[PDB]
């Protein structure tokens, strides 16, 4: 029948795999060299239970003037995909301080999902050494659930855009929450 359209907004810190996740979901191909700052004006076809849903993927950035026009993307949203890097936890601790209030103040009563992008780096030796140089450890799944507890988000799933693992169930959960 008619394919409903749901508005999806992906917010997160700089270089936390937002645009890469969107491109992997949409074009099925991980960008090699030229990854855009924002993946904009794309609608993706998805089906969860036979109900076709067109996900209007909206991308936000915090660089140059994109920070100023990021608030204008929030109106009419249906699901919010807050993004943090498993590699660098600084995004994880800065979620509740900045991103959760920002999302809630412009998107009341809207489902919230926080996703652990860069899941492949959890076991990466280089990233582990870089974190140990700064006395840090990769975000644990238990830590992700603990962060979701503070916000009260719809769910927490980890994504690895480079390996194309988890890039589908996250959007399925997002459109399921939007369908509510």
């Amino acid at each position: 029948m008619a394919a409903i359209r749901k508005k999806l907004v992906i917010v997160g810190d700089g270089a936390c795999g937002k645009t890469c996740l969107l491109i992997v979901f949409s074009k099925d191909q991980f960008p090699e060299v030229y990854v855009p700052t924002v993946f904009e004006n794309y609608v993706a076809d998805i089906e969860v239970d036979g109900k076709q849903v067109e996900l209007a993927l909206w991308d936000t950035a915090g660089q140059e003037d994109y920070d100023r026009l990021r608030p204008l993307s929030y109106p009419d949203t249906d699901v919010i995909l807050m993004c943090f890097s498993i590699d660098s936890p600084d995004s994880l601790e800065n979620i509740p301080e900045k991103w959760t209030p920002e999302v809630k103040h412009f998107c009341p009563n809207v489902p919230i999902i926080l996703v652990g992008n860069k899941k492949d780096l959890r076991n990466d030796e280089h990233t582990r050494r870089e974190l140990a140089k700064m006395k840090q450890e990769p975000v644990k799944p238990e830590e992700g659930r603990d962060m979701a507890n503070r916000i009260g988000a719809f769910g927490y799933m980890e994504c690895s855009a480079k390996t194309k693992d988890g890039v589908r169930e996250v959007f399925e959960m997002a459109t399921r929450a939007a369908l509510q």
Binding site: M1, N41, L72, D76
Partner: protein, 319 residues
């Protein structure tokens, strides 16, 4: 080169001054959808400016801009870029090309990959009750239907590339048939093209989808087009829907009035008591008319041929 220069070259339609845009964009790695080429507080790119400043109905800068955008990679982003302002949010270039009554550029945009199901959510695209001017259903196909443009409707529903399905609903749930009821006045001309387009779309949806009835998809308020016509004080489309007769055998099941027999001037016709006397388990047009139809047309809709006798027949039975 720069947006004040670009929006003037586009406005004047001078392709001779637009030659150097592509080498500049390629060597600077800039794109036509960049904020440096978009009007602030509006979000308008060069394409709406070209679609607004039309001389002789054509702007030669539009093909050049489309070619340049394809070369730079921003084709879908360039064509489907929506307005970001409060009063025009969601308005892509397809809505502008349809409202300007330029079928050629509508075909050009849809062929290149325009978002045919783009919803315009600005305050100017809200019902007059909610503080708006032009509520057309928020869809590019609904805009064409409410603008009385049958050729553009036929093209959008019969594209080789991407066809606008007629069963789609906007944020409020109104389909094309629901949007033809909110743009319908009681004047003779409005009641003469709104009903024609309503029948055109209903028959098109009956042929294209035999198993689906486009008049049975309720909006977010649970109102079918007949129910919304009864509620919002539209009598012409109300009478047309109730007294509907269609001759085509393939789509003869959409009739609501069935001439049972005829003897000279006298003829007996069966009226479908669907959504009118539904025995309570569903919503009824009669209840909407006698409770929620505060319009002054209530005493004129309570005189339609089935409704007037439907109420009277109830009086004899148990009344």
């Amino acid at each position: 080169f720069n947006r004040p220069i670009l929006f003037d070259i586009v406005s004047r339609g001078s392709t001779a001054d637009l030659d150097g845009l592509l080498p500049f964009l390629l060597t600077h790695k800039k794109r036509l959808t960049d904020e440096e080429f978009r009007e602030p507080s509006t979000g308008k790119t060069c394409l709406p400016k070209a679609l607004l400043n039309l001389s002789n109905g054509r702007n030669d800068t539009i093909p050049v801009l489309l070619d340049i955008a394809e070369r730079t990679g921003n084709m879908r982003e360039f064509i489907n870029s929506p307005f970001r302002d409060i009063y025009y949010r969601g308005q892509t270039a397809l809505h502008i090309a349809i409202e300007r009554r330029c079928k050629h550029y509508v075909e050009l945009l849809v062929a290149q990959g325009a978002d045919v199901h783009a919803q315009a959510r600005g305050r100017f695209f809200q019902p007059k009750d909610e503080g708006g001017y032009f509520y057309f259903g928020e869809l590019p196909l609904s805009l064409a239907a409410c603008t009385n443009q049958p050729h553009i409707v036929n093209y959008l529903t019969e594209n080789p590339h991407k066809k606008a399905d007629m069963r789609r609903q906007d944020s409020r749930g109104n389909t094309v048939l629901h949007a033809l009821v909110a743009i319908a006045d009681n004047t003779r001309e409005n009641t003469k093209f709104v009903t024609k387009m309503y029948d055109l779309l209903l028959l098109k949806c009956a042929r294209l989808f035999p198993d689906s009835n486009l008049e049975a998809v309720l909006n977010n308020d649970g109102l079918s087009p007949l129910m919304m016509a009864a509620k919002t004080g539209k009598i012409g489309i109300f009478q047309h829907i109730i007294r509907r007769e269609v001759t085509d055998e393939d789509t003869r099941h959409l009739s609501r009035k069935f001439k049972d027999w005829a003897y000279g001037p006298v003829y007996s016709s069966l009226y479908d008591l669907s959504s009118l006397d539904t025995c309570g388990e569903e919503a009824s047009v009669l209840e909407i008319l006698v409770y929620n139809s505060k319009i002054e047309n209530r005493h004129e809709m309570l005189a339609v041929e089935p409704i007037n006798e439907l109420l009277r027949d109830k009086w004899r039975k148990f009344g």
